[PDB]
Symmetry: D3
């Protein structure tokens, strides 16, 4: 049913001890920021590898700074709590870990810095699809992405996802698997829960960070692997809607989404299939990295030996 433990406000506690009142956190949720972190289980080594844990912890501390949450937790404490929780839950398999920080008050929605900062970390089993060949059909949404003027997409805020839900609900009702956003200027931004890459003429293209997107750690990883392992040109730039319709390949990338091939965009089929040849290479390389089977990228992994 539930994991054995969670982490909450500087301590590991049994799951059933984290009882609260229905009314306690609705106002707090408007302040909340979070991370998505994966642990990949290597049965041959008896080790969980938590992927880019310090980078995720640093981004959570940045998000919390941008919300104006008083300082309460450090990067090293978030890292250590994650390791301690994954070991104590004693689940030997792939996991998805969600640290979530919030400021509690004003049970009252419309100032953050007068509130107290709290955090929990919740680790649950989650399967990987990196051994599976699958693809999604995407649409561009009629709803525009949040931007720096109103709700900065650099901040990984729960509230941002209300805009994600406009797009993801439209995609589902209109017969698509997933939605991509345009920014207010009409340029390509990101997906509802991932960044997007395009392959054309043997090069990788992705919206630059100032297109109004999350600074995706899976995006950064893919840029490094594409340049370093495959020797590909990668362009971080402004990207137009119609050029993406002509892509040879496309894929989403994100911690939960891993590397998710895109078969079509607004019913324009990616010419080289899904996963196409370069996407297949990147998904296979990414898989060997996160499972601790590529020594070149060991510095990205935090091992948790579970004996």
């Amino acid at each position: 049913e539930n994991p054995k433990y969670l982490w909450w406000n500087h301590r590991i506690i049994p799951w059933e001890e984290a009882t609260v009142h229905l009314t306690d956190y609705w106002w707090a949720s408007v302040t909340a920021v979070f991370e998505g972190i994966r642990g990949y289980w290597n049965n041959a080594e008896g080790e969980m590898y938590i992927f880019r844990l310090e980078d995720h912890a640093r981004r959570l501390e940045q998000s919390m700074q941008l919300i104006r949450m008083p300082k309460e937790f450090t990067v090293d404490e978030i890292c250590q709590a994650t390791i301690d929780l994954v070991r104590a839950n004693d689940y030997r398999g792939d996991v998805y870990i969600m640290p979530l920080a919030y400021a509690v008050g004003n049970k009252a929605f419309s100032v953050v810095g007068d509130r107290t900062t709290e955090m929990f970390i919740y680790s649950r089993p989650a399967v990987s699809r990196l051994e599976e060949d699958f693809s999604l059909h995407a649409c561009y949404s009629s709803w525009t992405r949040i931007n720096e003027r109103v709700l900065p997409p650099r901040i990984k805020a729960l509230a941002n996802y209300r805009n994600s839900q406009l797009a993801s609900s439209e995609a589902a009702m209109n017969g698509y698997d997933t939605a991509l956003f345009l920014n207010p200027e009409g340029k390509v931004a990101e997906g509802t829960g991932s960044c997007v890459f395009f392959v054309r003429k043997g090069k990788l293209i992705t919206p630059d960070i100032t297109s109004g997107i999350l600074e995706s750690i899976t995006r950064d990883t893919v840029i490094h692997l594409a340049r370093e392992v495959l020797g590909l040109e990668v362009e971080e730039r402004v990207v137009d809607r119609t050029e993406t319709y002509l892509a040879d390949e496309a894929f989403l990338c994100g911690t939960h989404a891993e590397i998710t091939p895109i078969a079509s965009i607004d019913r324009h089929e990616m010419k080289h299939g899904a996963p196409g040849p370069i996407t297949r290479q990147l998904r296979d390389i990414y898989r060997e990295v996160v499972y601790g089977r590529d020594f070149r990228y060991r510095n990205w992994l935090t091992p948790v030996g579970m004996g």
Copy 2:
């Protein structure tokens, strides 16, 4: 400490029975919509008057429709639950009532229509300031209001308030009481938790609804009272920033905020004071209406006799 009861998913329950898990509602909160409703206690009559309850219930049903929450609760059930909760709590004094609806799943942030719709209603004591002469100093925020392109302000969504908090935190750190927003086109919108009115040359001016604001019930009330009781001209129109600096009077209006006079905007003082003469008249008329002391507007009140 706490009210005796709350209402949750079609039943009144004792407060202490509404226990839940820490992890239960974070994803749900991204779907959530809510109302703010006041009950005003008339000790002479032994009656609570809930103000424009059906209008609030109808707006909540509209918000829930716009989020795409499956149909579960009706307008008549929301009204009746509110009456039943205010009576059962047996608190003979002014209250603030928050119905909050949410869709629960995907404990997973980035489709609503596959989720189940839930709701609670929480009524707590809240004082009125309508017998008090006070005023606030406002600033226009450096942060822009959400708009129809990204997060429609007609929908009373919890997530909208992340944008309110950008502005309200800036106002507090910059030495102001409260913030006003501009919309993306640079026109005046609303406050962080209220609509705004301006008085100039004996007429009332307020941003039109398509300026990108909540369709405030207190705004509608004030328009009716200004025209019907005081015989004033009221203009619902596009409003510019600099014209508001020259206002004779200004005020916020909202269910929680009631009628809150504004003394200055970006350190431009309202010429006729705060509350100025017309604001004083409207605050006094509004007070006599909501306490059940003006028979002309009885159709706005839901009485709860508490014997």
Copy 3:
């Protein structure tokens, strides 16, 4: 197969005489403007009624002025040619008439005033659906309406319809009957080939002309009939996307489209059905006007007696 005649460059000619070269008009088409005009056949009177012919002729002369076509044809000549063509074709039934004006040169796409102005008028049988109860399911498009900055929608230019086709192709591939547009500011504009009306709380709402729409003659007609015959309030104003989801009724209006009820918008159902009660009244009144069965509006009709 084909009508007996058409009108071309100041004369009626037999259909088969209007032969031209494949290469003759591609460049000309970028300059072209047109009208849609209906003739309604009244078998009891032996008369075709051409609806608001002078208004259509005047708009065509305005469009041609805005394209900068040299003066060649007058309003009275367009009216007379239409009457002469409908009589000479000797088709006793409902028709749709398309005058189309173009400037020919530079067989060369990227100045109009150095070109010669030409025009034809093509009248063909077209059925009316005004005795039929039917409705369409609409979506708002991901593609934005043309605006005054780039391609003024007041000008009834053929080229405008490339933007209509972006939206109408998306609607069809996404399982809708018809598309509605937002303008660049995110406000409701028009349909791909019609204006749109909304009914809420017993009043009619339609985007104002400066929302970036054609100055629809069917729109003007409906405003007059709603105010004069039904006594309804009609608001020409800025209209938001989400308010239209809450409409009691909605309908398209246009010369070809007549009055076309809308059952839903982005899968939000119009509460009072389609045709709803007010839409039904307007469609029935409009039908009695255009068939010459309402003497109050005779001044809108041009009769062509066909003996």
Copy 4:
């Protein structure tokens, strides 16, 4: 008068056989896309060189995909038809070739994918000005360029040219030779029928493709020649209006326009003349390439031996 032949729907036919009805293609023209291709005659070799034919054919297939025209013609068939038509016309001199594809139906303007795809190719004599020293006086237009939100400029659609004509008519009435566009954000885009380059401090500057321009093949050619033959720095970037007023040199480039020097922009004279020194070098190099007198760039030429 006319060329001997044209190509239409998979066959070469005598010119006089391509007769059609006046009414046949007006609706089709709203779907239409096209290319401009030059053939350069080398009398010493008895060979026509068609410049970058496969690149033009590929762009036409992309445009047709973006319009959603059913698949009917291939890249290899467009190339072969062009070669076959230039040879069969037996005109030994410079030509301009226009393939034009259209979808025919709905003789009815406001879905493409239900239509049948057709195409013709029209080759006519056209002189080169590459041995001539001439320059144009440009203005920036008061009319804004089409953008991805409304009418993507990557698609070489006939309808786009209605926006070109707003600008080119203004330039002519205001005493200029040619117009340049700003995009909606106010940045430099393209000319009405060409891309634009600027020379300042010995480097070449041109608007990046996401400024909202056609992906000009003459632009690509000029970038290659500037870097490879002249060793110049070339910057593809966002370009401001006022910086272009300070350019040392400027020029248009396009298939029909070739390399067309600009003497002034809004009556600011280019400091180094027109053609200035670098423009002269590029025009001379481009001329030697397209006439088959530079073996380094042979892979750009398709020779048609005409004996």
Copy 5:
């Protein structure tokens, strides 16, 4: 050569006494705001009539408040100084009066409230053209009007006129008499030194104040006279570019410009001439008002008897 006197910092002084250093006011000019006021000489009465002096004085006090100039001068003092200067100059003829207020410091361009407020008033002969039938040819500028986001056009600031000069220089170099502006949204704003009115179908149309214009006193005057004397409908609303091309009449209005008919806009001729029939009526009525020959509007005039 020069007037006898000017007014400066609370006193009338002989002209030749207002000597200053070249370097004294360049930084001050960035803070400066001003008014334009006319005096009309009635030789039959021996009286100068200063038109709407208190309204001009009030707008200057508003401009100075918006710049944040410390309070130094009152409305009554500005009025009295104007009267005193026009009498002391002893010029019996039409005048144009410029009060100009500035804040002096930081001889240092990039805080106002730490500066001292100063003002002068300069009255000079200026002829009226209200007995003359003349018209101007206008263009819409390629340069956009200042808006509330960057430089509010309600404030009558000297610096605003740098944007006026972009447009007025373009008009002159492009062979027009005068320029009209579009605002950033592409809607009609104002002229470079006047507001604009359009006449179509017997009604008057003018951009609403929130289109981003000065709140012109001549505009207000014309609205009153059109409604009260002529019984015309006047619409203050958003106005589109292309509708103005179809106007029957058009005119500029402003204190210096008086009522200046517009013959054409971007070489579209106003159908009913310039001055057209309604413009002629308004110019004649305005003339009889400002010369003290219409008792209905005496309350607009400040008489200065000069014996």
Copy 6:
């Protein structure tokens, strides 16, 4: 009190001879453009070093060209006049020099090319803070930066500073030292009188020139020194608001401002202090360059030997 001399219209004159009338230059100021130039006194060498004089003179000639001032002064004459004035004033200490050019007429605000071009140069003592460790607290303004659509920020126009003053007055009233601007798209632009740099992860970031900023000579200098002396990566790119809150260091740069460290931005503290380590290095290197103590950059200095 005052310097001995100034330069005006091709000649050096004693200060007291530059007397003018109060009314002479208000209209002229709307046309005016200027430069800020520093002279740094090296007592050991007996030499003033004027920093990048030719670059400043060239930018002034560009500004004057963009205003459309008739040609009157050359770059070499501006350079020589500056040298001649600094020597003749015989002030042996640090100076700030302001050339200011204006066009005089139409004493009449709303065409430049019909006016006569004039210029003065004013040199005054000004201290350097380059031996001082100090920092400023910045805010982002609620007022937007001027852009190419309305008032190009490349032109160093006096009128631009009205927009600077909106921001600098807000910063002062809101308890900050200095203001930073966003451009209309919401991206980081410049300060009110300087460009801005950010340091993060050991690299330098600054808004690209097309973000809507002055082409700062101190910015160019800092880019050269950072790359050439320190070997740092420098990124000229679009910059977001929230990324700047996370900067390790930040600083303003400009001729008057020199290198001015920023301690915080909207009350987000720069992690590595102010001046932080890289800022300290750049300020020290810049100081040794401008005082003639670094032979590598001698070509930037104009020496004036004062014996």
